[PDB]
Amino acid sequence: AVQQNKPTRSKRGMRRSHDALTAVTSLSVDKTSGEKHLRHHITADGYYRGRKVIAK
Amino acid sequence: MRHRKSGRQLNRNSSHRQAMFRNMAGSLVRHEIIKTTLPKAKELRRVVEPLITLAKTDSVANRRLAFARTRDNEIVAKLFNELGPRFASRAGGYTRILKCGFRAGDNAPMAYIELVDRSE
Amino acid sequence: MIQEQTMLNVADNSGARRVMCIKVLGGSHRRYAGVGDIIKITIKEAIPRGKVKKGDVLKAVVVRTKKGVRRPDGSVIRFDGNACVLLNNNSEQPIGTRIFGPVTRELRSEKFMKIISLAPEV
RNA sequence: AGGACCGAACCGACUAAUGUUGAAAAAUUAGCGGAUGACUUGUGGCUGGGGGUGAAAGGCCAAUCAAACCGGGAGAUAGCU
RNA sequence: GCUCGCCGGAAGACCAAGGGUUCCUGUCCAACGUUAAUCGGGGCAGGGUGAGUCGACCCCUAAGGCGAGGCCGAAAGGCG
RNA sequence: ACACAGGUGGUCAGGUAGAGAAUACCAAGGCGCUUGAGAGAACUCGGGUGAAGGAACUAGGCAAAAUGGUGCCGUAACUUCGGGAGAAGGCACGCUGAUAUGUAGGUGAGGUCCCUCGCGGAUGGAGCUGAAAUCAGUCGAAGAUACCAGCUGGCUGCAACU
RNA sequence: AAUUCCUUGUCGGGUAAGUUCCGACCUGCACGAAUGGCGUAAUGAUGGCCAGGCUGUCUCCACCCGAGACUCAGUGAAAU
RNA sequence: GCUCAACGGAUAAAAGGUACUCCGGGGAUAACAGGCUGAUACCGCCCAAGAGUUCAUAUCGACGGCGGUGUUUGGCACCUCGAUGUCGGCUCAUCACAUCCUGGGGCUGAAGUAGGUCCCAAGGGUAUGGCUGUUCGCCAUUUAAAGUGGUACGCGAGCUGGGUUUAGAACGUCGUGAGACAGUUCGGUCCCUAUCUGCCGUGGGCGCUGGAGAACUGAGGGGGGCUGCUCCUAGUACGAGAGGACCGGAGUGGACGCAUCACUGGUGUUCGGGUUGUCAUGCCAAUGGCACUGCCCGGUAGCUAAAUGCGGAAGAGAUAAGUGCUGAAAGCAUCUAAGCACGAAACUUGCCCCGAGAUGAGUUCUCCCUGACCCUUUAAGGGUCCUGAAGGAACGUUGAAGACGACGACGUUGAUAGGCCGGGUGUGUAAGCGCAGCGAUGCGUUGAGCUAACCGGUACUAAUGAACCGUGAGGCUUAACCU
One DSSP character per residue, C30-83 reads -SS--TTSEEEEEES-B-TTSS--TT-EEEEEEEE-TT-B-TTTS--B--SS-E
For residues C109 and C46, give the distance between their C-alpha atoms in angstroms, rounded to a whole number: 30
Chain B contact present for A40, CB below 8 A: yes
Half-sphere exposure of B15 (CA within 13 A, CB side): 0
Chain A contact present for B92, CB below 8 A: no
Q: Tell me B8's DSSP state.
A: -
* CA-based nearest residue to B52, from B24, B19, B8, B90: B90
- Dihedral (CA of C10, C13, C16, C22) sign: negative
Question: Which residues, at least 6 apart from B76, have a Cβ–Cβ distance to it below 8 Å?
Answer: none
What resolution in Å is listed for this PDB structure? 12.0
Contacts of B101 in chain A (CB under 8 A): 38, 41-42
Chain A contact present for B97, CB below 8 A: no
- Main-chain dihedrals φ then ψ at residue C56, nearest 5 degrees: -80, 145
Nearest nt to the A51 alpha carbon by C1': H464
Nearest nt to the B19 alpha carbon by C1': E4
What is the separation of C-alpha B45 from the centre of its chain, rounded to a whole number of angstroms? 5
Element (H, E) at B95: strand B95-102
For residues C20 and C16, give the distance between their C-alpha atoms in angstroms, rounded to a whole number: 11
CB A42 within 8 A of CB B98: yes
Contact at CB, B101 and A40, closer than 8 angstroms: no
CB C63 within 8 A of CB C82: no
Domain around A12: 1-55
The CA–C1' separation of C26 and H351, in angstroms, is 32
Chain A: give the shortest CA distance to residue B110, in Å: 9
- Main-chain dihedrals φ then ψ at residue A44, nearest 5 degrees: -75, 20
Burial B93-103 (b: 16+ CB within 10 A, else e): ebbeeeebeee
Is the peptide bond prior to A26 cis by the omega test (within 30 degrees of 0)? yes
Q: Which nucleotides of G are covered by protein (CB under 7 A)?
A: 15-17, 52, 59-60, 63-67, 72-74, 79-80
CB C63 within 8 A of CB C83: yes
Chain A: give the shortest CA distance to residue B24, in Å: 22
Chain A contact present for B108, CB below 8 A: no
Q: What number of other Cβ atoms are within 10 A of residue B87's Cβ?
A: 20
Q: Tell me B31's DSSP state.
A: H
Chain A contact present for B35, CB below 8 A: no
CB C8 within 8 A of CB C21: yes
Cα distances (angstroms) measured from residue A51 to each of B32, B115, C6, C34, C49: 19, 17, 77, 74, 98
Chain A: give the shortest CA distance to residue B87, in Å: 20
The residue type found at B85 is P
The CA–C1' separation of C57 and G5, in angstroms, is 39
Contact at CB, B98 and A38, closer than 8 angstroms: no
**List of protein residues whose beta carbon is under 7 A from strand F:** B 1-2, 8-11, 37, 39-40, 106-108; C 1, 3-7, 65-67, 82
Instruction: Look at chain A and report how many structural domains it folds into.
Output: 1
Chain A: give the shortest CA distance to residue B99, in Å: 5
What is the separation of C-alpha B24 from the centre of its chain, rounded to a whole number of angstroms? 7
Element (H, E) at A9: helix A9-15
The residue type found at C39 is I
